[PDB]
Amino acid sequence: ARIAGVDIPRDKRVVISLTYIFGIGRTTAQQVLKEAGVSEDTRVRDLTEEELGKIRDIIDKLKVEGDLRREVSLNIKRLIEIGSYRGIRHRRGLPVRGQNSKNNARTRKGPRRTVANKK
């Protein structure tokens, strides 16, 4: 479990079912299915005994789950050892793309708490 992207779900149509794969998104799924000719097909999981394999190969050409996590990880590790400034933003809790800090930007900062008063 499973034949291609590991741990694809069940009782869902195949396109959203492999969008869950850490790699393929929506439009990429539209492309791999355009190569497939499945036409959707199948709402549940019942494709075909061999077609599941040929799709397994095309998905195999795409790459790849936790190694793709290793891509981003090795990339940011490349972005910290380089100096730096971008990875510096990655670990300050500072947003990296460049969008102030005086308000909001809590996506990294977190909620609580507060430690100031006047007067």
């Binding site: 034949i3 599941l52 195999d60 790459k63 190694d67």
Partner: protein, 64 residues
């Protein structure tokens, strides 16, 4: 071997999507298997599979 505690083990028929088969033993009469050592890229020598590691690093960026 205690009686009735241990499930019966009929001769297994391991199978795979690549058509590879293996003769073992299991509770089930037949066992389809998604992945085998003869199909997995690591056990099968050093197949490119999808990588092609290190392409490209740490630098190869030029355009004219």
């Amino acid at each position: 071997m205690k009686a009735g505690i241990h499930p019966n083990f009929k001769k297994a028929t391991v199978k795979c999507a690549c058509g590879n088969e293996f003769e073992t033993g299991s509770v089930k009469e037949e066992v389809r298997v998604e992945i085998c050592s003869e199909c997995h890229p690591f056990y099968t020598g050093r197949q490119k599979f999808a990588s092609a590691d290190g392409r490209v690093d740490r630098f190869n960026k030029k355009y004219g």
